[PDB]
């Protein structure tokens, strides 16, 4: 029976499958909030040049 299946079409035993990439996902780099408050200055000593 298996040999007859092979004789008909090999996909009945070992079908071809689509190739694809390995989705890894993001790395999720953490840090503190004050790091983003650098270069911020204050309204009464900055801007309007």
């Amino acid at each position: 029976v298996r040999l007859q299946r092979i004789c008909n079409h090999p996909g009945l035993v070992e079908p071809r499958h689509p190739g694809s990439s390995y989705v890894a996902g993001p790395l999720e780099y953490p840090s503190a909030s004050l790091i983003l408050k650098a270069l911020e200055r204050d309204f009464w000593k900055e801007a309007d040049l």
Binding site: L27, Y29, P30, S31, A32, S33, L34, I35, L36, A38, L39
Partner: protein, 429 residues
Amino acid sequence: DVTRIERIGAHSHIRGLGLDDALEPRQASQGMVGQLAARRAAGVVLEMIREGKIAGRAVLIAGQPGTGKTAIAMGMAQALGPDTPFTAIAGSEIFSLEMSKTEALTQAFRRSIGVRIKEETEIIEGEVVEIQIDRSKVGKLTLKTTEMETIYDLGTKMIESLTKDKVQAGDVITIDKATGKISKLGRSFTRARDGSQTKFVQCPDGELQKRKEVVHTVSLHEIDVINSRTQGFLALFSGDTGEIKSEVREQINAKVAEWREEGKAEIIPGVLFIDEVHMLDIESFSFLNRALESDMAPVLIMATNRGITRIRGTSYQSPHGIPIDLLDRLLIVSTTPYSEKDTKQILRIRCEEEDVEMSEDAYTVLTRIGLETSLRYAIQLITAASLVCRKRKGTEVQVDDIKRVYSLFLDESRSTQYMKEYQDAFLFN
């Protein structure tokens, strides 16, 4: 055993400096052997590092090849621990096409100075067995917790955020009180019962609103790169940093000082280690002269063997291949060659790390070979001899296995002789 990504290497056996509380070195401890004066000096430098008061200190480790200066540096790294920065590079690495040599050394300096920040958070937790959430939107947070259930009234203007990122029955989540963020844990067995790599925790515990402090240690280079661009933090991974503008760096220095005096941050000075500094050039050393005069500078450690050797970028010669303008600004640690007993003990430690059993006659022969040719050659023959022993189904390495491996693999002294026997065959002498 399953193969981890870290495997046994040249300096895997050393796990610290073998020093007592008085910085007096033991003969064999923590994988290190001998080099008592150099190990004591490294311990003194290590205590200088972890106190952190004095800035811009420079040290050089010098000696013949194979004398363990790189091993000493790795031992300092292990003894210091991960809570303090330790930047390690080779001198060849600063020659970048993306940035100048000074910029590379600048950001290598800044990777070695950590800024430690503590942040407070308020967080709510609960098990998603069911969500009775409609989305304006209406809900009551029908979640569970061991002490008492996570039912809680919700503000109608933002309940769509709870349903935004595919919150589904059979899960466990956490919610922030002030940020409004929501995060998931996945197919927990208590909720998902009726996926692989999901959080397999039980129902969460605590009184819902739990306090939590979190500590972040961020280097000055990270602060520079993050604030240099809209999405500059990607450059920390891609390495697409250009030459960072000086204007960004002094503003960040001022802000870090302000945080330090205000109590909102703490400075954690670290170490920059540059192995094989004789690849640096006059320009790099001249930059290092003034980079070490900053208050925000780390401790610098350098390694090079050399003698009187040409400085790169010049026709001049100087000790250690370094100009004497910089050698005045550092302390030199000298490593001496190893004795027979120290060589034998190092081979014993390496065999233990590699999980190799050898006869005492084999140890004697390998110690003879180590003094005769080189230490690293003798260390290399341990693995090959173990493999040769294994193929003959032996249990311990014998003298015959080492002689076989010595016949197969040979060192520079014999290769050069055999090359000279066929001088015309070998090319471009």
